[PDB]
Structure formats: structure tokens, C-alpha cells
Amino acid sequence: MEGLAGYVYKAASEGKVLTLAALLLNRSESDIRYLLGYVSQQGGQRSTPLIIAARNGHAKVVRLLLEHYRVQTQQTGTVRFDGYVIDGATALWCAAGAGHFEVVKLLVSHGANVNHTTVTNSTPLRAACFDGRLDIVKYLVENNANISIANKYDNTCLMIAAYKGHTDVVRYLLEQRADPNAKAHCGATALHFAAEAGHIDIVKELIKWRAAIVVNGHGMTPLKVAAESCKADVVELLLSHADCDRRSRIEALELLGASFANDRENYDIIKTYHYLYLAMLERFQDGDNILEKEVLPPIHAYGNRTECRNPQELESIRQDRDALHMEGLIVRERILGADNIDVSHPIIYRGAVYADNMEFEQCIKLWLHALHLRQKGNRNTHKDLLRFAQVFSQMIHLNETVKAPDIECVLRCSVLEIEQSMNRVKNISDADVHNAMDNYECNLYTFLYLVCISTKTQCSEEDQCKINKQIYNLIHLDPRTREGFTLLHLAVNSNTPVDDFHTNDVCSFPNALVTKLLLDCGAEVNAVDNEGNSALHIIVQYNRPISDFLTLHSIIISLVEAGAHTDMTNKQNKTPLDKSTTGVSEILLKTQMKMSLKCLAARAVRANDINYQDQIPRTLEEFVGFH
Amino acid sequence: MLIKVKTLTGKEIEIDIEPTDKVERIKERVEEKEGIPPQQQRLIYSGKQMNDEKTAADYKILGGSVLHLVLALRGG
């Protein structure tokens, strides 16, 4: 019975009808309901044979089961769409979700729940317009489908269609009494999605339908969303709404050119100055009723520019390549208040351009300010630290000095980030902690890269002491990875990956100097991992004592400099001398080894298994555990 | 038989000893051009260290090679 259900499910999914009919022939009523309805795990989908038939667009398979075999249309199943997983969706939901008109009409005629709700409060009509089929949307609406029903994210059928590039369903839904003032979870409406998407025709239908533009949950007007996302024509579409006043028209025009000044896919220099030219020209129109922009004080990261409070001020930098990029960053941050989750993207892009154009101080300043903005905004700045490591190692790989306070600030920002990253690992439950743990490990890798770069700096004594203090704080915040590895453990580990993009050319692992700097920062050399191994147990496992002997030797003497116990034994009961696999490594350990009576006595006690619990001092028990 | 043994900074050591000689006196000249006294350098023959006479034919009779000596003290 179990094997037969697999073939029947496969027959419905693969579209074959003759084989499906042959298996279901001479079947009793008990086998009819058991075979049609039993879930099968195929492609991450816990879908019934009817559901997968609707998902695969097999109308004939669905029709045969519906008309004669009488399969239920209220069965709940799981499907996997393009980046979305929907659970509990009926056959009607998946057929409209997959955009199969030939299957939706059969299911509704059978009497499927048109207003069926999935786990994320989703309607088959919403799935119909999400896919992009006009025929399914028109048929479902006439079959008592509530358009106003939104998901758990408060996104209606119009809003999901507005973000998509399907104008035909947008026009039909708007005229079918769909509220354009409905807001998402973060106050966003359909026009908020359409402005980011960049659909001129969809926005035109919304404003004619009395859009009544309102701010979202972030206090952001969607008219500036098109300006923020480099939508040139969309900005010049709502300024004629006759309710956008004059001051808001200034903000929309300034932001669009500022975004165009810094965009990888929308890089242009003639439209950068063009949109800023009209915004400041509209400012200087009343003459005796001038509207002055709220110019924030100039930022040291953005040079020493105080924006353009005069029309002729921007005219002098009309042909200026650097000023237009720099000015756009200032005005966009001034407009957005540096509070957006994506306002750092033009800044980080301009810094990336400067780094790719062999400009260093400017890109470091821009990236530092971007990191500050993202850290005060509570962002997962692991890629930020990765690109800091990349740019620092590229700067040091071309033999150019890098300023320590700039390195100090990002290092001082990293430790607070890593402190919150450890909080991110601990506070977040076992749902995304696996990605959080990887992000924390990446943060530790980036910290290792930046300290490795710091070993190559000129190391001015006060700034070097500042770096040492930040690393001291990080060490005293007891950082351990999922293998029990500390920063010392990964520093002595050759298996630790190093970024290939302009980083591995400088940072090589294991690195003795940073480990030495770890010893100068009071790192616990006697730490144990999940394997029970210490840094000494891992450094002896290096398989290259010939190619780089010094990076294997200078670390070990640096290792035994503050209390590295050479005679400690790991959880798997292996001496570091035993885990040598290299004559040079073991002879170096022996030269660094020094005998002690406690070592041999503890080894003798443990090898003979004398009861020491509640009979020796607790520190002696810990030493016994060490041996 | 010239010697090109590396050091802590990739320096040069002039042992100038044939493979039939013993490392007890071969390493004496190697550190003579380096600076260390003879009975102080724990010379490592890319996987093993010399002891007693330690005739150079035992270490594969390599010509020059890269002998990464250990500069440990108090060995005399």
C-alpha cells in the first residue's frame, strides 16, 4: 500500500493519465481516499497528488480525480515557489500560484475554497496576481475572492502585483475595488512597492485611482523612494499630483540626482548635475521668500564640503567629477538623515569605486562612516568587516602606509560588533543561529585579518596601545567559536580560510606575529577547544615545516611565553609531542619543553587511576584534568 | 661540498664539509660564518637533528640544501 501511493503520486505529478487510471482501477472506497490525499516529500514539497498535479499544470489529471474520483479541494499542502515556500496551500492556491489557468477553472467549478488562506494568510487570488496571469485574476475575482485580504505582512493583492512587472492585473485589481491606501507591516502601500520596482504605468494607474500618498512605517515618502532607487522617470511623475507642495518637490529632485551620482547600475554624470540643477533653481524662485535647505555641518569623512546653498555654488563644480560624487553623498545623507537601511549603499559604492581607482584615504573615510551608520543602525556588518580587511590588505600589498586611527576605529567598531555578534548568537534561538554563528566566525576572521594588517603598520606607540587595548577587551570578552576555538586557536590554525580577494596575498595562516600580539594582549594560551586541543596541539599539526619554518618556530616560543603548559593532554588523551607528525615540530617542542615534578606525578596518577576526587586541592584536580 | 643552510632570516652557513664528515664538526664551520658557537646550534636536517658525531652521509648526503638550524641556547 505504501509503495503504490508513491507511483500514484508520481503519476499525478508527471502528467501521465493512463498509468494513473490503471493503478486506481478496481480500488475500493478506502483506497480512494488513502491514495488521493497522502502527502509525499518531493522537491521539498509535502504536496498531495492533486496539489502537485495543479502545481505542474496537469488539468487532465486534476479533472479525472475531481469529476469521478471525487478528491477534496480543501487539502492543505506545502509548495516551493521561486524563493518562497508556502505551506498549507490547496490545489487552487498552487494552480494560481504556478499560473495555470487550465487548472484553476476546473477546481473552482468543482467548488474549491476561493478565499482559502495558507499559513501566511494568503489567498489563491493573491497567488494568481503574484504569478502574473490576468485570466486567473479576472476569473477568481468573479468567483467571490476577497481582494482586500492581505498576508501576515499586511500586503494585499494590489501591492504584491505593483512590485511585480504585471500591469494587466494591476489595472483590473484597481478597478475591482482594491484599497490603494492599505499599508504593509512597515506602513508601506502599493505605491511604495511600485516606486522601488520602477513601473511607470502602475504608478499612473494608482494616482488616477486617488492614491492619497502617505508615509510608511519608516517615515519615508514613496516619492523619494523612486529618487532613492535611481528611478529617473518615476520621480517626474508624482510632482504633478498638485499636492506635493514645493519643499517636498525639492527633496525628491535632490535625492534622485544624489542617488544617480552613486549607483553601480545607474552611474551617470550628466543626470547627476541635471536633477540637482532644477531642485536648487526651484529654491531660488521666490527671491524674497527663499527656502533654505537644512544644511548639516560638513563631515570630515566627506572632505570639507558644506553642500550648495547658492545656485552658482553648484555651477562651479558642474564639470567636477569628484565633487559631484562627494556632494551627492552629503545631500542624500542630509535628506535621509542617515537612518535608512540602504543609505550606506551609495556611500559604500563610492568607496568601492575609489578603492578600485587607487584612492585610499577617501574610500577608507567613506567606508568608516558607512560602518558607523550601519552599527548605530544595528546591522549585521560581517561583509563590512570583510571588505575592510580586503581594502586594508590591498593597501598594504601595494606598500602604502595605512593610518592606525582609521584602523583603530574600525577595530574599536569590530569589538563592539563582535560583542553584539556574540549576543546575536546567544540571544537568537536555534533558527538562524547557524547563520549567526557563521557570521560571528567571519567577524573573528576579519578581526584576525585587520590585526595581521596592523602588524605591518608603522605602529605609532599611542595608536598601537589603543589597538592592543581593543584586542585586550575582545580577549576579555572570552570569544569562542563552535569548535571551542579562540582567536588564538584560529591564529595558530593553518586550516583557517583567508579571503582570496586582495587579502590572502598578505594575511597568511598560521601567523606568529599576531599570535605574539595575542600573547602581548594576555590571551589565555591554556584554553581548550571542543576537541580538547590547545593552540600548541594545533600548531604542531602544520604540514609545512620546510616552506615556512619561522612561522612555525617563532610562534611556539611565543606560545610558551606566559604559561603555555607543554605537558597538558587533550580530551582525546594525546600529548602535543604525540600529535607532532614532524621531527622539526617535536624537536622544537622538546627544546621549549621543561620538566616539572607535578607533570610526571599527575601523569603517573592518571595512568594508574587513583581516586583523587575530594582528596586533593581543586587546582590539582584541574591539573590532573590537564594531564 | 659547499653549504647553503638557511637561518632565522634566511642567512647563509658555510659548513664546507663533505658528506663523509661528522656534523659534530661540520656544524662548527656552518655557525662560524653565522656567529653561533659550534656546541650551541641544534641543526635540523629537514626532519632530524644531529647527535654525537652524526656523520653527514646519514642525512641523505645532501649537497648544501636548506638546513633550518635551531638557535636554542644552553645546549653546551
UniProtKB/Swiss-Prot annotation, chain A:
One of its GO terms (biological process) is branching involved in prostate gland morphogenesis. Its main location: cytoplasm. Gene3D superfamilies: Ankyrin repeat-containing domain (1.25.40.20). The keyword Metal-binding applies. Coiled coil: none annotated. Activity of the CRL2(FEM1B) complex toward FNIP1 is inhibited by BEX family proteins (BEX1, BEX2, BEX3, BEX4 and/or BEX5) in absence of reductive stress. Mechanistically, BEX proteins act as pseudosubstrate inhibitors that associate with FEM1B via zinc in absence of reductive stress, thereby preventing association between FEM1B and FNIP1. Keywords: ANK repeat, Apoptosis, Cytoplasm, Metal-binding, Nucleus, Repeat, TPR repeat, Ubl conjugation pathway, Zinc. It comes from the Eukaryota. InterPro entries: Ankyrin_rpt, Ankyrin_rpt-contain_sf. Widely expressed. Highly expressed in testis. Weakly expressed in other tissues. ANK repeats lie at residues 45-74, 87-116, 120-149, 153-182, 186-215, 218-248, 483-527, 531-568. Zn(2+) 2 binds at residues 186, 218. Zn(2+) binds at residue 186. Belongs to the fem-1 family. Substrate-recognition component of a Cul2-RING (CRL2) E3 ubiquitin-protein ligase complex of the DesCEND (destruction via C-end degrons) pathway, which recognizes a C-degron located at the extreme C terminus of target proteins, leading to their ubiquitination and degradation. The C-degron recognized by the DesCEND pathway is usually a motif of less than ten residues and can be present in full-length proteins, truncated proteins or proteolytically cleaved forms. This is Protein fem-1 homolog B. It comes from Homo sapiens. The gene is FEM1B.
Curated annotation (Swiss-Prot), chain B:
Interacts with AHR; interaction is direct. Interacts with NUB1; interaction is direct. Interacts with ESR1. It is found in: Nucleus. GO terms for biological process: anatomical structure morphogenesis; modification-dependent protein catabolic process; protein localization; protein modification process; protein neddylation; proteolysis; regulation of postsynapse assembly; regulation of proteolysis. The modification N6-acetyllysine is found at residue 48. Residues 70-72 are annotated as: Interaction with UBE1C. Cleavage of precursor form by UCHL3 or SENP8 is necessary for function. This is Ubiquitin-like protein NEDD8. GO terms for cellular component: cytoplasm; cytosol; extracellular exosome; glutamatergic synapse; nucleoplasm; nucleus; postsynapse. The modification (Microbial infection) Deamidated glutamine is found at residue 40. SMART domains: UBQ. The record marks 8, 44 as: Interaction with UBE1C. Changing residue 40 to E: Impaired ability to activate cullin-RING-based E3 ubiquitin-protein ligase complexes. There is a cross-link at residue 76 (Glycyl lysine isopeptide (Gly-Lys) (interchain with K-? in acceptor proteins)). Ubiquitin-like protein which plays an important role in cell cycle control and embryogenesis via its conjugation to a limited number of cellular proteins, such as cullins or p53/TP53. Attachment of NEDD8 to cullins is critical for the recruitment of E2 to the cullin-RING-based E3 ubiquitin-protein ligase complex, thus facilitating polyubiquitination and proteasomal degradation of cyclins and other regulatory proteins. Attachment of NEDD8 to p53/TP53 inhibits p53/TP53 transcriptional activity.
